[PDB]
Amino acid sequence: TTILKHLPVGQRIGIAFSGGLDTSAALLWMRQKGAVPYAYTANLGQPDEEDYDAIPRRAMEYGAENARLIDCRKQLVAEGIAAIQCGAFHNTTGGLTYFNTTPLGRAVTGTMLVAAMKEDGVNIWGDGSTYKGNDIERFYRYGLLTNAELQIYKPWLDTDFIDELGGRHEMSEFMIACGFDYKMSVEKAYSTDSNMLGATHEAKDLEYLNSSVKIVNPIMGVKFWDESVKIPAEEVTVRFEQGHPVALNGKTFSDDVEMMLEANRIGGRHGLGMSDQIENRIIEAKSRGIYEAPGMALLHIAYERLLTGIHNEDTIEQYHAHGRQLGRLLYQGRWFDSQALMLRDSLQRWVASQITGEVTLELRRGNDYSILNTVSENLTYKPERLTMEKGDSVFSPDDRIGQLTMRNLDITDTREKLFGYAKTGLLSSSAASGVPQVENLENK
Amino acid sequence: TTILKHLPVGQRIGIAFSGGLDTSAALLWMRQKGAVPYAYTANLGQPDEEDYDAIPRRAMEYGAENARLIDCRKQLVAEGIAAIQCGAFHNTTGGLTYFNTTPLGRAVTGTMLVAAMKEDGVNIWGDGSTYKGNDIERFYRYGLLTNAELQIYKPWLDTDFIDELGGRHEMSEFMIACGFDYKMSVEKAYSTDSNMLGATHEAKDLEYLNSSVKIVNPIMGVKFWDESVKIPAEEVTVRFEQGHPVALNGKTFSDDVEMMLEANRIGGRHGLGMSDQIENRIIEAKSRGIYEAPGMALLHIAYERLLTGIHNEDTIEQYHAHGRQLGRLLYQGRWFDSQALMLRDSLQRWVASQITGEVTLELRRGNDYSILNTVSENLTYKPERLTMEKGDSVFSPDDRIGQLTMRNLDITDTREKLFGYAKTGLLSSSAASGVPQVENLENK
Amino acid sequence: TTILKHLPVGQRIGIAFSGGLDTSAALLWMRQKGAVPYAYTANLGQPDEEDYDAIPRRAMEYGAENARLIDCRKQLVAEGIAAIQCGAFHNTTGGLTYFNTTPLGRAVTGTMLVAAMKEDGVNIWGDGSTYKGNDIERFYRYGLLTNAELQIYKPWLDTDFIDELGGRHEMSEFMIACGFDYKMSVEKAYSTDSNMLGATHEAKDLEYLNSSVKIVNPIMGVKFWDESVKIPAEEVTVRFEQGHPVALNGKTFSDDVEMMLEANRIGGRHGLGMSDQIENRIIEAKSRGIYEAPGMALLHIAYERLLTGIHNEDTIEQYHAHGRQLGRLLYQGRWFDSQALMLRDSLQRWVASQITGEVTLELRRGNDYSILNTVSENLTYKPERLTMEKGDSVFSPDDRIGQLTMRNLDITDTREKLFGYAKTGLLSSSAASGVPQVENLENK
Amino acid sequence: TTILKHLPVGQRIGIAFSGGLDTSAALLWMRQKGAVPYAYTANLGQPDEEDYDAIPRRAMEYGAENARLIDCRKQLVAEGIAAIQCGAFHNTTGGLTYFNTTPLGRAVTGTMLVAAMKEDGVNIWGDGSTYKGNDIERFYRYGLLTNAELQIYKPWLDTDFIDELGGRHEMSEFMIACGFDYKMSVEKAYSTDSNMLGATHEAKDLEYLNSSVKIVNPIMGVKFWDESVKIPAEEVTVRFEQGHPVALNGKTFSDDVEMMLEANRIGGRHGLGMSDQIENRIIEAKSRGIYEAPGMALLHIAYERLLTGIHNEDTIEQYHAHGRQLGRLLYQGRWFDSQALMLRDSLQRWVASQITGEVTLELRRGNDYSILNTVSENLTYKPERLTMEKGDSVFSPDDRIGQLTMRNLDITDTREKLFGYAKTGLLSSSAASGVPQVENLENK
């Protein structure tokens, strides 16, 4: 059996230990009931975390056999950069994009923490991810891809667990009954999950479509919708070498994690990258979220502007189509499946490899920015190529006339189709007024 | 022969008469050389045109046999609304979109003015569209689809024409030599083409990638990048009935043209919808443009937000894929070809028909706005459906466990593929650190 | 609760009564245990059924409250024709195709029999479809789409049912213990499911990949692989009007069911349309089947040959892409979902509507046939259009030279990309020998 | 200027010297008029060529400065194998496929012969490919990608050439007037172009759709449609290692050219792989051809059968979609463009790399064959996985019930859409009879 519904007494069980009430109470309870819990805390460069080292120590205090801090920043940023290179984003509204930051975080922690558990002889993961979300499924696959012998204990399937730690208040009472003066965090009107690529806000009041970003206190940027917050316009340069982001404002970095942290600071000052999406969950039901990803947004804008100046139309269209499809697979927890790897590897090799260049932007408030300059030794755009100024052209007016004439047979075929569609009722006429009129409900 | 290189003396020739120097000098010249020109001016609701009635009168004064004002506003707005319903936009940069406003305008005028010419027994169109642009090709097909017997005279293929009206100065001198005290318009640092769906700015200084929107004086909106321009935040509501935009700020309109003019006013106050694109022309070479489309942008944002709250994932993905493909066909001048009609009709019938609802936005500067509310009697998003509050769920925790178990065989297959790809060199390992590592250049 | 695990005593329960041992024993058992079963038999024009009227009478004899014969032939053939018009087939191997005949049959019976049950005040369906197949899921959705109040009783979830009717032998013993001298059918080396569109053979010895079509006794055609079976070559004509198949061998029919029965006879004489597929089930695991669909294959060949002579390339490619996607949705039981309806309606309206014409074939053995003639008043293929004979061409040699020159800028860009890819290691060189060499494992 | 319309007197000009009347007369004429022609003959393993060495000697006799035999077999077969691995075939009719053998041949010779010319200081190619075909465009790009300084002389643009060598008879008379007792080949009712991957037959009587394969004398196989030709059934095995075809009938080869020649012999004995296609040319007008490719067909069937037993559904669908798109690019002469390389490299790396296995077939006549066995150490199909025999399953009946329940919310949404579409007129009803009825012309 892969899924365990009862606490495996006397056995080693791993817990992805965040340090919050849920994992603190669960770890203490698992130790108290006879299991041997091992805690693993992922360093994800969370914007609202200032003391990762204190977390494993809290796990030991609550009963962990051993507690480790697993650094996942390097891997997280590497996958985030791959996602930018592939345009692996599928939830967009009016062009505004969610950068799939939670899905990227899960691909990294679901594999890395289970690998750390395996290394320690821990083959059971006590994962509390809930039954209505996407993470329960993402963690299930990533964990099993990493350890074929993995078993997953879902505490909420254990009646003994539910009877004692059924909610926040029960858990708080439990900690106190166990001798720990636990202090709960201040309640918010929504729930937040974050990593150094982005933050997601959902649930509670954000379940209502008449709530908006205004109820959120951003953790990676400023409240740009508040007129009293001063945000001076700022010029910023983003430079890539073979698809890899290497410099911001003319400066290079010791590693990609430092680069991403600076991208976040720059975008954050403006509130760049925030969006509000209604999305389709893996289970085919909709949820709503508010998102932040300042650095990812900054890199995305510059990367796409260079793409438009370097690649041909067929290639750009394959980037958009394959990237969206890849974004959906990423969201589904299938980032390492063959159908995703084949799209990601393709886009990195043939599209991203040629993205060498620099884009200059002026950032103002929120998503309001302007492109100021675009340069690249690989540009196929050239000011002289299609200019009507001066002269000297690769093709002549007579050449274009020949190209137009080559369209004649197909134009005749299309006209004949218009007559055919009018005869079969799909068009009112192939003309009337001149413009063909399609016969459907939207034709007023 | 379809294309004529010599002025057809003694024959009727139609001219799409804009009223500018080029069409004024060409019409006068064609009359002077023995042809019988007929002028057709399209009323396109251009933002920078205040006196359409004066244009046909100027055509008569310069030599037109007859001059007509053909109203194309109703048809233009109908096609613009269809484009919104279909998401028929393919040039996007970092999510910012060009609304294909010139391609829509050409589909309407290329067919309507040629139909008006045919009605008057005019079977030759003297069209000066240039040899390096997209319009020469769009007009060629739309014209021939409308009139199988159409011939197109390209003045720039006529050496006599070039010898006399080779440039702006030659044309100006010609008007004066012909007895007309012609007054040229003030020169700008770029060229503009517009209609009531949008304005495009290109050429001259905009050919350089280090020029930006700041050199443009917007004609449909304000200079939002200028801090001295005051733009108060504004709440706006956009309501649709079966995919059709029917109310703005709770008010309905006498017709769709009035609706679009109000959408433009609202978005215009904020500079909503402006973008800067490097695009691929039909001839496979790149050009650069600055675009305005305030009303189209406002409707697009609201339409997509409703789409995300109403349709399932497969359907939304077909809207994005088919809409982009349709946008490319529209740009190519193939809006009435079978491959475009089949996508447009499909999206209107099955996607747009269910878009009944209202979206509330707060518009600030440029593209910076926030979504404040989303309502629809057709929403499939419901706050109660996936909430962890209260209780009562359509599926249980045990149900989700079963769904996860059904993934086991495919998860095993994927793990086996990871081992297989590591063996064949595509992955460093199926793990190392835990995260599979793809073997390509972007892997640092 | 939608799914019921216990027999609903005293309530009306509908059974899709095939007349075999499984449904005979289940109906008798349900009556014996206190339920009130209503039997519904679908007339699907099964090739191996000679007495549909006897079935409802057998249901009454075994305990049915009422038993009805629901004719589904007209609807089945209508959906089969729609599938041909849309090329809604996704499981192909080396070009050989499975015509999704079981998925079409389920869409029709899942909706029609539940509608018949609802009409009779029966809101519970006792459906034995098994837990490992595709049908359990197809019937579940089609049933619930038709009756929102439907509950589905799965007998195999009832321990009392399993204890008594656990297998074929137990069921046979049960019938006898209940007073019925039941005579089981002769056992075969595989299982068969059929309707007038096609027959599927799977399970038992067909689970082994070293078994082949040779172990199957075809029920819609002859054993064409057996040299001793004589099959004279046969000329056949298939004619369509606006996408609808109307004549075979110059003869018309009283209705589409008669047409399809004749198509099956013609193809059947040759064994046309048989295939062997390894396919992916809805649950993401593979199964193997042997298939027959003589009439569907005959119509498919003629329809596609006309498509190639009538439609442009973009349109043909949309037919292939959208048709495959639609085939997958059909297989998933999503034939009536928005994402499927939008593809099916599109293809019927814009692709099928223009398919008017006739194709002549010579059928020999199995899939070996030749196309002998293709005619259509809508052909865009014309022998004179691209012939090098005589003369008179719509475009001239000079015109083609101009069209070639228009490719120059993009050719330069591609060459530059080849140099760029060689520099970044994706190509060995942009040349070596002359042919660019891609750097991957398949490059020997 | 890239294209030359006049013979470049005193300059070196390369000719792709086939040895037929056209290239013999053209080379002699070019020498006679003052140019310095260099002949290049591609060894393409043509099925109807028995003496390649005699060709360069004939070129010298007619006036070549130097004449070389360039072996292109290794490169041709490498690209043919890549095409099989990628399913790069887009012209299919009823599942029957054209294997893009001419497009593959042109990609290889267009680059290799121009590279050979460049190596010899020859920067002008006298290429007679005609103005109405696809090759003029394929050769133009492949040549210019290989040599940026290439100029192409089209003899048919030279009036002096046309005046003297306007047709077959004029050319024959020319050879004789120049002192060569030239003997023309026997005339056929169609034209043929071939290489070791396949042969194409077109033009003359094949321009008429009432002509058929029966007028063709196959050059790579037998006349399988002729009952008097005896073709015994034959068992054949095809084995792949990591996507590469390595053994036929249990035997390996010294190189891939020998392997392909044996594949051709095996398929040829049966006439496997012949098809008749109406296709869309690059210029958007249709042509008709008869095709042969026995070896390619044999490898394609085995490769796809293994694909279906090894890869998941998303991956197989990407293979079909990306492969067709790649086939169209190959046909267009864009095999080395970024948009093609990105699809080809992707499919080779992630799809083909896992195709290790062996398929056994029984070949009979033409396309009539049966699959007899399928084996692979990489199969994800397993007879035990979904069998209802014995027991022991990875998922239980209860697990499937949970998976079904997870569909409930989306099923409700779809039902609601059916009601919505009936209300807006797209469906007659969400039911009537039970089956939803789409409101379009094909609904009888």
PDB file of N, CA and C in Angstrom, chain B residues 337-381:
ATOM      1  N   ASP B 337     -10.769  33.742 -45.229  1.00  0.00           N
ATOM      2  CA  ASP B 337     -10.417  32.435 -45.787  1.00  0.00           C
ATOM      3  C   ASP B 337     -10.988  31.332 -44.905  1.00  0.00           C
ATOM      4  N   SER B 338     -11.197  30.152 -45.479  1.00  0.00           N
ATOM      5  CA  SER B 338     -11.817  29.057 -44.729  1.00  0.00           C
ATOM      6  C   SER B 338     -11.168  28.719 -43.402  1.00  0.00           C
ATOM      7  N   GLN B 339      -9.839  28.745 -43.376  1.00  0.00           N
ATOM      8  CA  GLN B 339      -9.110  28.403 -42.164  1.00  0.00           C
ATOM      9  C   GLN B 339      -9.307  29.425 -41.047  1.00  0.00           C
ATOM     10  N   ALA B 340      -9.628  30.668 -41.421  1.00  0.00           N
ATOM     11  CA  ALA B 340      -9.907  31.687 -40.412  1.00  0.00           C
ATOM     12  C   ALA B 340     -11.392  31.616 -40.014  1.00  0.00           C
ATOM     13  N   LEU B 341     -12.293  31.546 -40.999  1.00  0.00           N
ATOM     14  CA  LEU B 341     -13.717  31.481 -40.682  1.00  0.00           C
ATOM     15  C   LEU B 341     -14.039  30.306 -39.749  1.00  0.00           C
ATOM     16  N   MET B 342     -13.403  29.145 -39.971  1.00  0.00           N
ATOM     17  CA  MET B 342     -13.668  27.971 -39.130  1.00  0.00           C
ATOM     18  C   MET B 342     -13.272  28.147 -37.655  1.00  0.00           C
ATOM     19  N   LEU B 343     -12.237  28.949 -37.403  1.00  0.00           N
ATOM     20  CA  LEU B 343     -11.813  29.253 -36.028  1.00  0.00           C
ATOM     21  C   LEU B 343     -12.703  30.343 -35.427  1.00  0.00           C
ATOM     22  N   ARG B 344     -12.961  31.395 -36.197  1.00  0.00           N
ATOM     23  CA  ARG B 344     -13.779  32.504 -35.703  1.00  0.00           C
ATOM     24  C   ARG B 344     -15.221  32.109 -35.381  1.00  0.00           C
ATOM     25  N   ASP B 345     -15.846  31.373 -36.298  1.00  0.00           N
ATOM     26  CA  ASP B 345     -17.202  30.899 -36.078  1.00  0.00           C
ATOM     27  C   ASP B 345     -17.294  29.956 -34.864  1.00  0.00           C
ATOM     28  N   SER B 346     -16.313  29.070 -34.735  1.00  0.00           N
ATOM     29  CA  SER B 346     -16.260  28.126 -33.630  1.00  0.00           C
ATOM     30  C   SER B 346     -16.214  28.872 -32.293  1.00  0.00           C
ATOM     31  N   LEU B 347     -15.259  29.799 -32.167  1.00  0.00           N
ATOM     32  CA  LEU B 347     -15.066  30.529 -30.919  1.00  0.00           C
ATOM     33  C   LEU B 347     -16.305  31.386 -30.597  1.00  0.00           C
ATOM     34  N   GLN B 348     -16.907  32.008 -31.615  1.00  0.00           N
ATOM     35  CA  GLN B 348     -18.105  32.807 -31.361  1.00  0.00           C
ATOM     36  C   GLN B 348     -19.255  31.940 -30.881  1.00  0.00           C
ATOM     37  N   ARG B 349     -19.449  30.791 -31.517  1.00  0.00           N
ATOM     38  CA  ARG B 349     -20.567  29.938 -31.143  1.00  0.00           C
ATOM     39  C   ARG B 349     -20.453  29.245 -29.804  1.00  0.00           C
ATOM     40  N   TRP B 350     -19.284  28.696 -29.503  1.00  0.00           N
ATOM     41  CA  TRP B 350     -19.167  27.891 -28.293  1.00  0.00           C
ATOM     42  C   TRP B 350     -18.472  28.512 -27.096  1.00  0.00           C
ATOM     43  N   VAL B 351     -17.644  29.516 -27.346  1.00  0.00           N
ATOM     44  CA  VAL B 351     -16.959  30.192 -26.266  1.00  0.00           C
ATOM     45  C   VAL B 351     -17.683  31.487 -25.930  1.00  0.00           C
ATOM     46  N   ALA B 352     -17.799  32.382 -26.905  1.00  0.00           N
ATOM     47  CA  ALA B 352     -18.429  33.685 -26.654  1.00  0.00           C
ATOM     48  C   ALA B 352     -19.891  33.633 -26.231  1.00  0.00           C
ATOM     49  N   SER B 353     -20.645  32.686 -26.785  1.00  0.00           N
ATOM     50  CA  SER B 353     -22.072  32.606 -26.479  1.00  0.00           C
ATOM     51  C   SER B 353     -22.385  32.498 -24.993  1.00  0.00           C
ATOM     52  N   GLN B 354     -21.468  31.922 -24.209  1.00  0.00           N
ATOM     53  CA  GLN B 354     -21.693  31.781 -22.778  1.00  0.00           C
ATOM     54  C   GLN B 354     -21.111  32.910 -21.926  1.00  0.00           C
ATOM     55  N   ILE B 355     -20.493  33.900 -22.569  1.00  0.00           N
ATOM     56  CA  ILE B 355     -19.905  34.996 -21.810  1.00  0.00           C
ATOM     57  C   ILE B 355     -20.948  36.085 -21.527  1.00  0.00           C
ATOM     58  N   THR B 356     -21.688  35.867 -20.445  1.00  0.00           N
ATOM     59  CA  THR B 356     -22.689  36.804 -19.963  1.00  0.00           C
ATOM     60  C   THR B 356     -22.217  37.163 -18.562  1.00  0.00           C
ATOM     61  N   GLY B 357     -21.987  38.443 -18.296  1.00  0.00           N
ATOM     62  CA  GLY B 357     -21.484  38.796 -16.975  1.00  0.00           C
ATOM     63  C   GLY B 357     -20.959  40.213 -16.961  1.00  0.00           C
ATOM     64  N   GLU B 358     -20.378  40.626 -15.836  1.00  0.00           N
ATOM     65  CA  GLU B 358     -19.878  41.986 -15.671  1.00  0.00           C
ATOM     66  C   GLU B 358     -18.601  41.994 -14.846  1.00  0.00           C
ATOM     67  N   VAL B 359     -17.622  42.776 -15.291  1.00  0.00           N
ATOM     68  CA  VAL B 359     -16.371  42.886 -14.581  1.00  0.00           C
ATOM     69  C   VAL B 359     -16.160  44.329 -14.184  1.00  0.00           C
ATOM     70  N   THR B 360     -15.694  44.530 -12.961  1.00  0.00           N
ATOM     71  CA  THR B 360     -15.402  45.871 -12.458  1.00  0.00           C
ATOM     72  C   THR B 360     -13.894  46.020 -12.338  1.00  0.00           C
ATOM     73  N   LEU B 361     -13.356  47.119 -12.864  1.00  0.00           N
ATOM     74  CA  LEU B 361     -11.920  47.369 -12.791  1.00  0.00           C
ATOM     75  C   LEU B 361     -11.657  48.736 -12.185  1.00  0.00           C
ATOM     76  N   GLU B 362     -10.452  48.898 -11.656  1.00  0.00           N
ATOM     77  CA  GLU B 362      -9.986  50.216 -11.220  1.00  0.00           C
ATOM     78  C   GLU B 362      -8.828  50.528 -12.194  1.00  0.00           C
ATOM     79  N   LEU B 363      -8.993  51.546 -13.033  1.00  0.00           N
ATOM     80  CA  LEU B 363      -7.943  51.922 -13.979  1.00  0.00           C
ATOM     81  C   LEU B 363      -7.088  53.028 -13.378  1.00  0.00           C
ATOM     82  N   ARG B 364      -5.769  52.894 -13.491  1.00  0.00           N
ATOM     83  CA  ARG B 364      -4.869  53.907 -12.963  1.00  0.00           C
ATOM     84  C   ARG B 364      -4.098  54.486 -14.136  1.00  0.00           C
ATOM     85  N   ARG B 365      -2.798  54.227 -14.252  1.00  0.00           N
ATOM     86  CA  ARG B 365      -2.048  54.761 -15.395  1.00  0.00           C
ATOM     87  C   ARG B 365      -1.580  53.666 -16.363  1.00  0.00           C
ATOM     88  N   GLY B 366      -1.699  53.923 -17.671  1.00  0.00           N
ATOM     89  CA  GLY B 366      -1.229  52.945 -18.648  1.00  0.00           C
ATOM     90  C   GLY B 366      -1.846  51.569 -18.477  1.00  0.00           C
ATOM     91  N   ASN B 367      -1.004  50.545 -18.356  1.00  0.00           N
ATOM     92  CA  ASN B 367      -1.500  49.184 -18.185  1.00  0.00           C
ATOM     93  C   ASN B 367      -1.710  48.793 -16.730  1.00  0.00           C
ATOM     94  N   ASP B 368      -1.550  49.747 -15.818  1.00  0.00           N
ATOM     95  CA  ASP B 368      -1.690  49.468 -14.380  1.00  0.00           C
ATOM     96  C   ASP B 368      -3.162  49.608 -14.011  1.00  0.00           C
ATOM     97  N   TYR B 369      -3.797  48.486 -13.690  1.00  0.00           N
ATOM     98  CA  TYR B 369      -5.206  48.473 -13.294  1.00  0.00           C
ATOM     99  C   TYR B 369      -5.388  47.306 -12.332  1.00  0.00           C
ATOM    100  N   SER B 370      -6.537  47.256 -11.661  1.00  0.00           N
ATOM    101  CA  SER B 370      -6.819  46.130 -10.771  1.00  0.00           C
ATOM    102  C   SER B 370      -8.211  45.628 -11.038  1.00  0.00           C
ATOM    103  N   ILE B 371      -8.413  44.324 -10.862  1.00  0.00           N
ATOM    104  CA  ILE B 371      -9.768  43.786 -11.033  1.00  0.00           C
ATOM    105  C   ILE B 371     -10.415  43.904  -9.649  1.00  0.00           C
ATOM    106  N   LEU B 372     -11.617  44.480  -9.610  1.00  0.00           N
ATOM    107  CA  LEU B 372     -12.342  44.680  -8.351  1.00  0.00           C
ATOM    108  C   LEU B 372     -13.532  43.742  -8.136  1.00  0.00           C
ATOM    109  N   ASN B 373     -14.164  43.277  -9.211  1.00  0.00           N
ATOM    110  CA  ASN B 373     -15.308  42.375  -9.057  1.00  0.00           C
ATOM    111  C   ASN B 373     -15.543  41.631 -10.361  1.00  0.00           C
ATOM    112  N   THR B 374     -16.121  40.436 -10.242  1.00  0.00           N
ATOM    113  CA  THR B 374     -16.451  39.577 -11.379  1.00  0.00           C
ATOM    114  C   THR B 374     -17.742  38.865 -11.042  1.00  0.00           C
ATOM    115  N   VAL B 375     -18.763  39.065 -11.866  1.00  0.00           N
ATOM    116  CA  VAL B 375     -20.049  38.400 -11.679  1.00  0.00           C
ATOM    117  C   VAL B 375     -20.564  37.803 -12.984  1.00  0.00           C
ATOM    118  N   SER B 376     -21.302  36.712 -12.862  1.00  0.00           N
ATOM    119  CA  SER B 376     -21.914  36.062 -14.015  1.00  0.00           C
ATOM    120  C   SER B 376     -22.880  34.971 -13.583  1.00  0.00           C
ATOM    121  N   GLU B 377     -24.076  34.969 -14.172  1.00  0.00           N
ATOM    122  CA  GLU B 377     -25.040  33.914 -13.862  1.00  0.00           C
ATOM    123  C   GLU B 377     -24.510  32.565 -14.416  1.00  0.00           C
ATOM    124  N   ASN B 378     -23.472  32.627 -15.259  1.00  0.00           N
ATOM    125  CA  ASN B 378     -22.867  31.439 -15.866  1.00  0.00           C
ATOM    126  C   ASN B 378     -21.541  30.997 -15.238  1.00  0.00           C
ATOM    127  N   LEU B 379     -21.124  31.647 -14.155  1.00  0.00           N
ATOM    128  CA  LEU B 379     -19.876  31.244 -13.522  1.00  0.00           C
ATOM    129  C   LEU B 379     -19.870  29.793 -13.098  1.00  0.00           C
ATOM    130  N   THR B 380     -18.748  29.121 -13.342  1.00  0.00           N
ATOM    131  CA  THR B 380     -18.575  27.769 -12.829  1.00  0.00           C
ATOM    132  C   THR B 380     -17.673  27.884 -11.596  1.00  0.00           C
ATOM    133  N   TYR B 381     -17.098  29.066 -11.378  1.00  0.00           N
ATOM    134  CA  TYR B 381     -16.372  29.308 -10.138  1.00  0.00           C
ATOM    135  C   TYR B 381     -17.452  29.596  -9.068  1.00  0.00           C
TER     136      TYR B 381
END
